[PDB]
Amino acid sequence: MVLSEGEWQLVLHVWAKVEADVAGHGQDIYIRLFKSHPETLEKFDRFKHLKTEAEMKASEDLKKQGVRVLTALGAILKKKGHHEAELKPLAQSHATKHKIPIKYLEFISEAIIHVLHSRHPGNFGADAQGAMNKALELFRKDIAAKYKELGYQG
Ligand code: HEM
Numbered sequence: 001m002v003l004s005e006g007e008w009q010l011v012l013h014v015w016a017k018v019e020a021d022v023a024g025h026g027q028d029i030y031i032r033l034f035k036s037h038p039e040t041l042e043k044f045d046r047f048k049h050l051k052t053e054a055e056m057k058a059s060e061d062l063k064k065q066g067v068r069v070l071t072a073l074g075a076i077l078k079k080k081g082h083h084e085a086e087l088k089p090l091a092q093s094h095a096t097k098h099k100i101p102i103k104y105l106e107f108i109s110e111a112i113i114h115v116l117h118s119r120h121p122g123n124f125g126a127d128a129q130g131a132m133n134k135a136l137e138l139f140r141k142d143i144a145a146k147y148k149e150l151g152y153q154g
C-alpha cells in the first residue's frame, strides 16, 4: 500500500491547518470520538468518568492528551510512509498497555476525518479527504501488522 507524493501533499496541507491550534483540534476529535462511540471512552482510566461534552471541553488533562495524540500522528504523517521507528513504541503501548483494538483505531480515524471535514473545507475537499483516508488506512494497516507481531489480535 503506497501513497503518491501528491496525496502526501494533500495530507500535509490540511495538517498545517491543524497545527495552527493542535489543542483545539484534539478536543474536537476526542469529543466526536466519545460521542459517536462511547465504548472507546472506557479505555481511558483517567477520563472514563467524564459525563458530558462540557466536562470533556473543560478537562485540561484531556486537552493535553489530544495534543500528544495529534503530535504523534503528525510525526507519523510527515514520514510519508517511512514510519517504522515511530510505530514501534505506539503499537507496543496500544496493544499491551492500553489494549486498543483496530476497530477503535478505525473509530478515531473516522473522528479525525469528520473534524477536518467540518473545520477545513478549504483544504479538505474530496481529493484531500481521500488522501487522508489513504494515509490513515496505511497507518492502521502497519499498526495491525505490528500488533500481530507483538501477540495482540487487535
Ligand atoms: C491516531 C491513533 C492514535 C494515536 C496516534 C495515539 C497516540 C497516543 C500517544 C502518543 C499516547 C501517549 C504515549 C503512549 O502511551 O503510547 C497515547 C496514550 C493512550 N492512548 Fe492512544 N493514540 C491513538 C489512538 C487511541 C485510541 C483510539 C484509543 C482508545 C480508544 C487510545 C487509547 C490510549 C490511552 C488509554 C492512552 C493512555 C492515556 C493516559 O495517559 O491517560 N489511543 N496515545
Ligand SMILES: [O-]
Binding pocket: 069
Ligand atoms: O490516545
